[PDB]
């Protein structure tokens, strides 16, 4: 009934004015189910815009 997987990814940035450090997170949800014949899994590639 539709499944998903959760992936946490950190990303950091630095401002040029105050000297503080930014460390944020995004959690991607990866889609339901793919795969060849019962071996390990599958996924397609590409690029998208947040």
């Amino acid at each position: 009934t539709i499944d998903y997987n959760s992936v946490t990814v950190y990303h950091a940035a630095l401002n040029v004015e105050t000297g503080n450090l930014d460390v944020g997170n995004l959690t991607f949800n990866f889609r339901e189910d793919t795969g060849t014949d019962t071996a390990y899994g599958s996924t397609t590639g590409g690029s998208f815009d947040l």
């Binding site: 105050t18 000297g19 503080n20 450090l21």
Partner: protein, 50 residues
């Protein structure tokens, strides 16, 4: 010269250059006084007697 930073994150908060050793107007609603005899080394010159 005074530099203030947080104790668990380390993000920059403020800095000052003072003469009378009173840190005023950087931490909201509180004024901080630092003793005048902090961080000085004393010696005696006998060739010039000063």
């Amino acid at each position: 010269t005074i530099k203030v930073t947080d104790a668990h994150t380390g993000k920059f908060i403020g800095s000052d250059s003072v003469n009378d050793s009173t840190l005023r107007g950087v931490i909201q609603g509180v004024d901080v006084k630092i003793d005048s005899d902090v961080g000085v080394s004393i010696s005696w010159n006998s060739t010039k007697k000063t």
